[PDB]
């Protein structure tokens, strides 16, 4: 009763503060510069060998090897330069919707409908890749996972909850519980001190890893947020949602700055990624092709057409050399 | 060959990996995947037991055919976000308890009816065949003798006999199949002490396979 009224008053206060902070629009400031003329990226490489829909890919920190997860229970490590398979890890459960590459490169992680995050050691004294840890504490499907370091990993699940684990012991040291809908994405900050997570309740929550509690909440979408990504600066992020819309939220301003959408697109967004400088926002839509937007002007700079099904995953190298797009047609494509 | 010895050996390793991947993916193409669905009291623990957290996978064999059943009832999350993982599937085995026409959790039979309506007309299963099982037929036979079916369907207007009532329930469930020109519904009445459902699933899957490779051959 009274608590609900207090919560409504607090929400109104937050909205009023955000409106007061809205001095201007980023579009007005960015209208004074020349946009990118026309981005034209051709398929430099085509990686084949997956025999099912590809659901997640992740580049290595050296940005030459990349891990890819598919529904045939396969985790393939590709040498992007020469197009050869370094490793092919068979998964215990073929229902996987996420995969991660350790920043050091010694480990990979995967998870899905088994509610478990499995860690595989790439560099063993033997010649194989073996599973080291099975983090099983979530009550819903695992939507994303990101290595903090060689021994810390944060995983978001469909039980409206994120967790930060200790891979040495396998026990989730921290639990982040503030979401009302299933969490579908994660994005570590460049300094890896805090992260963002978008949920099915059209809300993106920024959490602090060290304290363990939610720091900020952003609400500008209308449907589920399927993808989130952090700006290279670290003071902004982008969310792709099911209403065919991307939104650029800020941290210090605590409000959305730009809305990337078009009347010609009515299909959801499965993945987002940024260029190295952050000028290009790459979003993998459901219309079988990715779109490259000018992140400062909200202009569709280009289209990465060339996939025969939905683009599920999409990543950018650490040096910004290439863009990898996976898709439901079982083919990965490196563009430049 | 403009390659080093190490690079050539790496290419050879990649070729061996390719061969293993092709063999694995050709082994998985000869297996039949069935998605099992139902309600809490609909009854699918008996069906799994007869033809034999996270989702459960059951493997069995029948007449040189390997079947995988995906029991996903434990995933108490948004079904819209993980149902497309089963888009390419041979058939959907939908279990419904026909003895709960008067039970209340909101009638249980009505809950099963809306769940069937949602699953059958799903965008990911616009052509996937459905094997409908109606479980606990002895309990329904005992219940219909005393309590009329009109509890669930006020507009029944039919004889209060097991055969007519069961036929009416089956017709009511099959009428939810919107656009019945691309998909089939293989309704079946089962019981706890009845071992014939494996053959029924095998026949339905055989028809599905015939249709699938007729599409593959381009005859359709």
């Amino acid at each position, epitope marked *: 009763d009274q608590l609900r009224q207090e919560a409504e008053q607090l929400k109104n206060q937050i909205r009023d503060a955000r409106k007061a902070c809205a001095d201007a629009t980023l579009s007005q400031i960015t209208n004074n510069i020349d946009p990118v003329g026309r981005i034209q990226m051709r398929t430099r490489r085509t990686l084949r060998g997956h025999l099912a829909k590809i659901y997640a890919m992740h580049w290595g920190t050296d940005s030459r090897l990349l891990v890819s997860a598919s529904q045939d229970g396969k985790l393939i490590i590709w*040498d992007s330069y020469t197009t050869n398979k370094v490793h092919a890890i068979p998964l215990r459960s073929s229902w996987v919707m996420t995969c991660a590459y350790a920043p050091s490169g010694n480990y990979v992680a995967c998870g899905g409908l088994d509610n478990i995050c499995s860690i595989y050691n790439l560099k063993t*004294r*033997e*010649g*194989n890749v073996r599973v080291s840890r099975e983090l099983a504490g979530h009550t819903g499907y695992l939507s994303c996972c990101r290595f903090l370091d060689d021994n810390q990993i944060v995983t978001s699940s469909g039980d409206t909850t994120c967790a930060l684990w200790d891979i040495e012991t396998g026990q989730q040291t921290t639990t982040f519980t503030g979401h009302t809908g299933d969490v579908m994405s994660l994005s570590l900050a460049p300094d890896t001190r805090l992260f963002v997570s978008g949920a099915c309740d059209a809300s993106a929550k920024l959490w602090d890893v060290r304290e363990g509690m939610c720091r900020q909440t952003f609400t500008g979408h209308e449907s589920d947020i399927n993808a989130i990504c952090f700006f290279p600066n670290g003071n902004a992020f982008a969310t792709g949602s099911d209403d065919a819309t991307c939104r650029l939220f800020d941290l210090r301003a605590d409000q959305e700055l730009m809305t990337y959408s078009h009347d010609n697109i009515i299909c959801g967004i499965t993945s987002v990624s940024f260029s190295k400088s952050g000028r290009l926002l790459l979003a993998g839509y459901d219309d079988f092709n990715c779109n490259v937007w000018d992140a400062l002007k909200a202009d569709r700079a280009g289209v990465l057409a060339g996939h025969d099904n939905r683009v599920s995953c999409l990543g950018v190298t650490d040096d910004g050399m290439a863009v990898a797009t996976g898709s439901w047609d079982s083919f990965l494509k490196i563009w430049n | 060959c403009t390659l080093s010895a*190490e690079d050539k*050996a790496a290419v*050879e390793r990649s070729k061996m990996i390719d061969r293993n991947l092709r063999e694995d993916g050709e082994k998985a193409a000869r297996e039949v995947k069935l998605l099992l669905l139902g309600a809490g009291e609909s009854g699918k623990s008996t069906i799994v037991k007869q033809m034999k957290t996270g989702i459960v996978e059951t493997h069995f064999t029948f007449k040189d055919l390997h079947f995988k059943m995906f029991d996903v009832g434990g995933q108490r999350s948004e079904r819209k976000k993980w149902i497309h993982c089963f888009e390419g599937v041979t058939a959907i085995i939908f279990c419904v308890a026909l003895s709960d026409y008067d039970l209340v959790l909101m009638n249980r039979m009505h809950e099963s009816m809306k769940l069937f309506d949602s699953i059958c007309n799903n965008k990911w299963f616009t052509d996937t065949s459905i094997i409908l099982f109606l479980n606990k037929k002895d309990l329904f036979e005992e219940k219909i003798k005393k309590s009329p079916l009109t509890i669930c369907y006020p507009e029944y207007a039919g004889s209060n006999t097991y055969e007519e009532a069961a036929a009416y329930i089956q017709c009511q469930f099959e009428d939810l199949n919107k656009r019945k020109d691309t998909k089939e519904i293989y309704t079946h009445f089962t019981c706890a002490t009845d071992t014939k459902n494996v053959q029924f699933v095998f026949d339905a899957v055989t028809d599905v396979i015939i249709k699938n490779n007729l599409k593959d051959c381009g005859l359709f």
Partner: single-chain antibody
Amino acid sequence: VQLVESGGGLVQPGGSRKLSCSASGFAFSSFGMHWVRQAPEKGLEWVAYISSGSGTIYYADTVKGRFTISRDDPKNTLFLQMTSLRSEDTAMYYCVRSIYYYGSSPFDFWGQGTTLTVSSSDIVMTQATSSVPVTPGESVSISCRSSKSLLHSNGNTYLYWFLQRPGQSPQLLIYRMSNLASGVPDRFSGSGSGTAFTLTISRLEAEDVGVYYCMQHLEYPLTFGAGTKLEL
């Protein structure tokens, strides 16, 4: 991981013998394997190579057409059949594992060695230094020269450094110049520029005293280099 060799012994010249190495402790089927021989008083010399799945088999021109290498993957064993044993075939044979992918470390583990005594275009690798007198705690640089440039188009410089302690099989320190192996102390460092290479030890204990060999993996037949003994 271990590789135990068997065979050897005293063989009359013109005879034949089969060397068998049993591998136990690693995924044998995913490793290419090599036979490398060392004369009773001379340095190392490569002999044979068989890939993963036996899809590629190479021999040295000193033994090509006379030796036959093979592998039993299900039984986890490597075989070398030697026919028409000359008097120059007496040596100690080491079976070596090497796996080739991006970032791999070939020649990482060496076998114990089996002895074999018989009764009575190549890239030349030069180790001019020999019997270098050294003292613990100092810094020692070992030089090496190559007849052909080991640097490749992709950017790799296929120069490998091996340390053989007295009475022990050689062990890998650097598997490509400036790439330190696993389990090797950080003091060892490798550098090179074209056809001239240098292995540096900033501080040395009494353990790292022995013969230092250089190998090239640019092209077959994988020519080694002469020894560089270090004296305490």
